């Protein structure tokens, strides 16, 4: 059932916005990255391109690829997507404007497909990290260890847990329109779309037309090449110009809700328990920085906290009634230290 979210698919178009460091510098990429969310734990980021990949223009195959080239879409194959950061990421799934991808940490986020003639990427700043949930501060999820309640995004699309406003596009520039009528500047239209037109000189002042000419002005560089083409709504990017007329409809879901997955998760190597008189020597040797902590169960709590990444023999003045001990997200231990001094 890839055919349950024609809310977005039929009605939304691949938006194009201003990528900030688009290979060279600020281009206008269709895959302009907004709303980077390195807020989960599972090595995953949910991203929004302004491009709406997924099904085609019409009806088929999530795994195809529709961005904007020109005023027009290009609903073709996804062949060579690349999200990346400090390292190349791993795609997880796309739906709508939105992609989920398993990334490592990275100061930035750097996205891009390959149309085939050109690289045509888009890149952005965003502070990314991946702490796993647990008192172990890994840099990456392992193959083993305990499972425990992480925060993470779904693989799936059949999703309604939230919805973001997606009303119309405003106009857009297209000076490919403003040709010349052998002495006058000549506007045309896409398909009968609504072209909003006048020039610095006095001539036609609104523009809701088929292909007009321009009686007064001559220069292409002093005219209103506009495309009110609101047959398909958009995401309400900050890098969108408002459609000044109205808040049109187009409430549209988000696929990648943050969910309470139990990540395959961390585990720190077991401790070396060593006895002394009402005292735990613990030669200790972790894999990664591990937050150890305890609770001397007297009404005097006297707890301790210390991230341990360097192997360290530590000590704990255990009392008569007991202490507990938390080697990372490994479960909490407990200890009777009554006498040992005879």
């Amino acid at each position: 059932d890839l055919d349950t979210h024609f809310t977005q698919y039929k009605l939304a178009r691949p938006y194009i916005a201003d990528c900030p460091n688009c290979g060279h510098s600020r281009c206008d990429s269709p895959i302009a990255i907004e709303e980077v969310r390195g807020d989960a734990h599972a090595g995953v980021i949910r991203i929004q391109t302004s491009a709406m990949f997924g099904l085609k223009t019409d009806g088929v195959d999530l795994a195809y690829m529709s961005f904007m080239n020109g005023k027009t879409q290009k609903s073709i194959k996804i062949d060579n997507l690349h999200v990346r950061t400090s390292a190349p990421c791993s795609l997880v799934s796309h739906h709508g404007y939105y992609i989920l991808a398993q990334c490592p940490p990275g100061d930035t986020v750097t996205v891009g497909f390959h149309d085939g003639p050109n690289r045509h990427t888009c890149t952005v700043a965003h502070k990314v990290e991946f702490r796993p949930v647990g008192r172990e501060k890994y840099r990456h999820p392992p193959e083993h260890g305990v499972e425990l309640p992480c925060n993470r995004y779904t693989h799936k699309r059949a999703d309604q847990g939230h919805y973001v406003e997606m009303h119309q596009p405003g106009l857009v520039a297209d000076h490919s329109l403003l040709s010349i009528h052998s002495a006058k500047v000549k506007i045309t239209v896409p398909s009968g779309a609504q072209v909003k037109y006048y020039c610095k000189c006095p001539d036609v002042r609104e523009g809701i037309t088929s292909s007009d000419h321009t009686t007064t002005c001559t220069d292409v560089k002093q005219c209103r090449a506009y495309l009110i083409d609101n047959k398909k709504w958009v995401y309400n990017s900050g890098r969108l110009p408002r459609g000044e007329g109205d808040t049109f409809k187009g409430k549209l879901h988000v696929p990648f809700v943050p969910v309470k997955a139990k990540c395959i998760a961390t585990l720190a190597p077991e401790p070396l328990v060593e006895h002394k008189h009402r005292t735990l020597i613990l030669h200790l040797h972790p894999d990664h920085p591990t937050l150890l902590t305890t609770r001397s169960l007297g009404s005097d709590a006297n707890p301790t906290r210390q991230w341990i990444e360097r192997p360290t023999t530590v000590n704990f003045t255990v009392t008569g009634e007991g202490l507990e001990y938390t080697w990372g997200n490994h479960p909490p231990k407990r200890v009777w230290a009554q006498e040992s001094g005879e």
């Binding site: 609770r295 169960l297 009404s299």
Partner: protein, 150 residues
């Protein structure tokens, strides 16, 4: 987190916002038993003219303390047991009895010279003796919980 920094021994849940298992202080508890559950006194064996002695008292938490009891019964059957003194905590609630046999129980204490009474179904006895310290103290929480001046 408070399940890692609290005092007096608590655990926590995002559930009704409980703080489980907070071991602190005492609770004045009172029960009304069903009288049907009682056994009348003339049906349990009278055990007096007995003798009690430790044999290997372990000055410890786990029920390492033991003591034979020269049971001197009248009938034969069960006999609930308890140390009304809190010095000794006993693993066995009840001991079976033939006609005046002997049956060891297990317990734990905190005073080197455990002079605790033992009430074997209406027959008191001092199980006086002496205990030995253990060696092996790194596992969960005790059954003794009776530390005082010793």
């Amino acid at each position: 987190p408070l399940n890692d920094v609290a005092p007096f021994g608590c655990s926590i849940a995002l559930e009704p916002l409980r703080a489980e298992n907070c071991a602190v202080g005492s609770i004045p508890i009172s029960i009304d038993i069903p009288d049907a559950a009682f056994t009348r006194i003339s049906e349990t064996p009278t055990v007096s003219d007995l003798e009690c002695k430790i044999t290997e008292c372990t000055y410890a938490s786990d029920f390492g303390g033991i003591a034979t009891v020269a049971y001197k019964s009248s009938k034969a059957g069960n006999c609930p047991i308890h140390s009304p003194s809190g010095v000794a905590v006993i693993k066995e609630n009840d001991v079976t009895l033939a006609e005046s046999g002997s049956f060891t129980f297990h317990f734990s204490t905190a005073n080197i010279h455990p002079a605790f009474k033992l009430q074997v179904c209406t027959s008191a006895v001092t199980c006086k003796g002496d205990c030995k310290p253990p060696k092996d103290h790194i596992v969960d929480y005790p059954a003794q919980h009776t530390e005082s001046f010793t």
